[PDB]
Design a protein around this ligand. Structure first.
Ligand SMILES: OC[C@H]1O[C@@H](O[C@H]2[C@H](O)[C@@H](O)[C@@H](O)O[C@@H]2CO)[C@H](O)[C@@H](O)[C@H]1O
Ligand SMILES: OC[C@H]1O[C@@H](O[C@H]2[C@H](O)[C@@H](O)[C@H](O)O[C@@H]2CO)[C@H](O)[C@@H](O)[C@H]1O
Length: 270
């Protein structure tokens, strides 16, 4: 199992674009989309050699844990040991899935979900990035990460025109953060101040504040965070970096949550 993206708000007409690596010995992979793990508007399952299928896409819904009627396509534009991109557009009547070869297909919204709040990846596909339309990842929670020492995540977003604050939290869970990263445009009596902190068993550590503030209301921004056991390296927009001490005993980052006045356009996992 890989990434579980939750707290999404993919509204009708909006898409997510998942790019990943198909394993050299791929048998099967899954992208599960919907409300939660039990309530899927799309179980998208390319089966290379699994479940009685060879080189066949199987799609289904999952309602209260129950599988529905399966749909199989003829096209199979996936190859072990290659990069593939899959786009899923949410809509009220039908989802649209766009595959690597140009091919598209429809899958009915049977649960009549209002939005996609949840995407999980499983099987023989290593997610490299997820890209999001509109404000669908504004509250993104990325769980079941396994960001090991030396590994980075890259967040690209648009700061809101009237932005007060945004946050990127990285650690084990919401109470155990090796980095709470908090650019404050105008929040908690700080103006244009980056505040960083740890959180250990729910308790805030000692803040670190930066001098530079390479963010602007309304501007796109890219932030990269590299996890190492001693320090995290934060690559701020436009060629600035700083380090933040890792004050927790985590040996990997399993959790990233984004909130506030930053519309996440993509997350990439290096
Ligand atoms: O340390 C991160 C958290 O800060 C909280 O605000 C602090 C503030 O930064 C500090 O100057 C002092 O006044 O105490 C406040 C309360 O701990 C935020 O409220 C919180 O959201 C985090 O950003
Ligand atoms: O529907 C998705 C679901 O399929 C299950 O396997 C099915 C299989 O696809 C079908 O051809 C066969 O007749 O029944 C199987 C269930 O007994 C998988 O087990 C599950 O993981 C999903 O992929």
């Amino acid at each position: 199992s890989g990434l579980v993206a939750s707290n999404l708000n993919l509204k009708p007409g909006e898409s997510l674009r998942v790019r990943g690596e198909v394993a050299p010995d791929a048998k099967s992979f899954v992208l599960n989309l919907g409300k939660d793990s039990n309530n899927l508007c799309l179980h998208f399952n390319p089966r290379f050699n699994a479940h009685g299928d060879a080189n066949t896409i199987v799609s289904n819904s999952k309602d209260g844990g129950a599988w529905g009627t399966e749909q199989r396509e003829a096209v199979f534009p996936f190859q072990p040991g290659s990069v593939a991109e899959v786009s899923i557009t949410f809509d009220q009547a039908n989802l649209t899935v766009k595959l690597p070869d140009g091919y598209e297909f429809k899958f009915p919204n049977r649960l009549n979900l209002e939005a996609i709040n949840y995407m999980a990846a499983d099987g023989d596909f290593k997610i490299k990035s997820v890209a999001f339309d509109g404000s669908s990842a504004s509250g993104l929670v990325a769980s079941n990460l396994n960001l090991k020492p030396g590994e980075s995540l890259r967040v690209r977003g648009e700061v809101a025109p009237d932005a007060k604050s945004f946050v990127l939290n990285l650690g084990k869970d919401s109470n155990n953060l090796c980095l709470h990263f908090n650019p404050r445009f105008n929040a908690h009596g700080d103006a244009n101040t980056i505040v960083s902190n740890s959180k250990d068993g729910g308790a805030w550590g000692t803040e670190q504040r930066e001098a530079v503030f390479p963010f602007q209301p309304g501007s796109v921004a890219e932030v990269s965070i590299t996890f190492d056991q001693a320090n995290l390296t934060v690559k701020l927009p436009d060629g600035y970096e700083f380090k933040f001490p890792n004050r927790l005993n985590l040996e990997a980052i399993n959790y990233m949550a984004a909130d506030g006045d930053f519309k996440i356009k993509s997350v990439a996992f290096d």
